[PDB]
Amino acid sequence: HRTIQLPGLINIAAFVPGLVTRDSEDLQRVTQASIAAGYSMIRIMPVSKDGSISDVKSLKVAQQNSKRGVYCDFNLSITATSDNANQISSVAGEVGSLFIPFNHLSDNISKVTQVEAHFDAWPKHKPIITDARTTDLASILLLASLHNRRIHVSAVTTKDDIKLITLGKQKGLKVTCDVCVYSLFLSQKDCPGCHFLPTPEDQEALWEHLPIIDVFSIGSLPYQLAHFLKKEADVTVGIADALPLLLTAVVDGRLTVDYVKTRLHDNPKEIFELHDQVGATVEIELDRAFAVPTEGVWSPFAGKVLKGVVQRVTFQDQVACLDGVFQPIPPKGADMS
Prior knowledge:
Layout: E1 3-7, E2 9-14, H1 26-37, E3 39-44, H2 56-64, E4 73-75, E5 78-79, H3 85-89, E6 98-100, H4 111-121, E7 128-130, H5 134-146, E8 151-153, H6 159-170, E9 175-180, H7 181-185, H8 200-207, E10 215-217, H9 221-228, H10 242-251, H11 257-271, E11 281-291, E12 305-315, E13 318-322, E14 325-326
Parallel strand pairs: 2-3, 3-4, 5-6, 6-7, 7-8, 8-9, 9-10
Antiparallel strand pairs: 1-11, 11-12, 12-13, 13-14
Helix pairs in contact: 4-5, 5-6
PDB class: oxidoreductase
Keywords: TIM-barrel, de novo pyrimidine biosynthesis, CAD, URA2, oxidoreductase
Assembly: monomeric
């Protein structure tokens, strides 16, 4: 029975449906399922179900929802819009990153100009993250190069985009990227109607560019998939699946433990300037098989057998999980901003 000791892991994209809902338990519960899965630090995706962290008011609602106590450490983030660059800059010290989606932006004026404003107003050493594709992606990569600062591209899915990122990297452009774990194990072959999943050719291009991929994230893809298939809006979809899917690929000889570790700890920690966590540890029975629970949270792998059981997670001097089972200890997590 193979056992490995890992530090507390990092998910740079944790989706919280009721993030900006008043008095919502969503954020807390996401931190529960996170620590139970081995993630002692998560970045909260500023875009939620029917809202987003886009202004001062929105930030505070998200902050209040953390006051009832969290079970892992976390950072908030803020979404860019057409007229946002001003207010979100006065609040940069309370969040850990700026998220720039291109669907939030106005058609009245060059989306290049709108993004340039944030690049002018946002601190140069504070991370910026985007889900831009194709020409939007090339546009924000140009700005990062022209301001000689860093840019992180999230939920990469296509051959075209990962190859453009490869080219940027070779020319010294300060770009990093992640893929959602589900993207590596689900494609349009598995769901032709799901055009947010990669094509089989896209997915193969992702496996062939693993050196280019700096980070693994969970993302909103698990939630987007479940919603499109009309399952329960369960707030923890995809959290307990991600690492076992990766460790199953390790056992199958497609990945190495160190690659997984760097993509879920070392690299996300440096790119997003995250602090050290003393006392956060994860013990994993790498070879132990288990059936993806056909009960609790919906999973596209329900009833399938994966490898990789989270034997023990420590956090803040307490045992936060045993055999993947959340331990009802006092919440000791904190906002790291």
